[PDB]
């Protein structure tokens, strides 16, 4: 009985406290519901923005990259996606 937008608010709250582990769980739930077709004012792009960053803070560069690429595909002029993609691709070369 939490709406899509309620779950996004929960994940944003957790993110603002630096709780990236629970940010991921909340944002994955939001994204699941959006990808299933449910209505909301929150956009897929907004979710992928927080999700990719929290995943990165947890240390998963490959998943942060994949999420950032999806974010950019849906939001080419996004404030952060393009710059994060460049940075993440750099970190990939340290492998």
């Amino acid at each position: 009985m939490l709406s899509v937008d309620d779950c996004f608010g929960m994940g944003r709250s957790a993110y603002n406290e630096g709780d990236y582990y629970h940010t991921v769980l909340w944002m994955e739930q939001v994204l699941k519901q959006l990808d299933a077709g449910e209505e909301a004012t929150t956009t897929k792009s907004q979710v992928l923005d927080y999700l990719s960053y929290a995943v990165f803070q947890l240390g998963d560069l490959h998943r942060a990259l994949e999420l950032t690429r999806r974010l950019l595909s849906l939001d080419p002029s996004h404030e952060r996606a393009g710059g994060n993609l460049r940075y993440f691709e750099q970190l990939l070369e340290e492998e």
């Binding site: 944003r12 993110y15 603002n16 923005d49 927080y50 960053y53 404030e79 952060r80 710059g83 994060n84 460049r86 940075y87």
Partner: peptide, 9 residues
């Protein structure tokens, strides 16, 4: 360039 700032509050 450095990475963008983190997502806002």
């Amino acid at each position: 360039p450095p990475p963008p700032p983190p997502p806002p509050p």
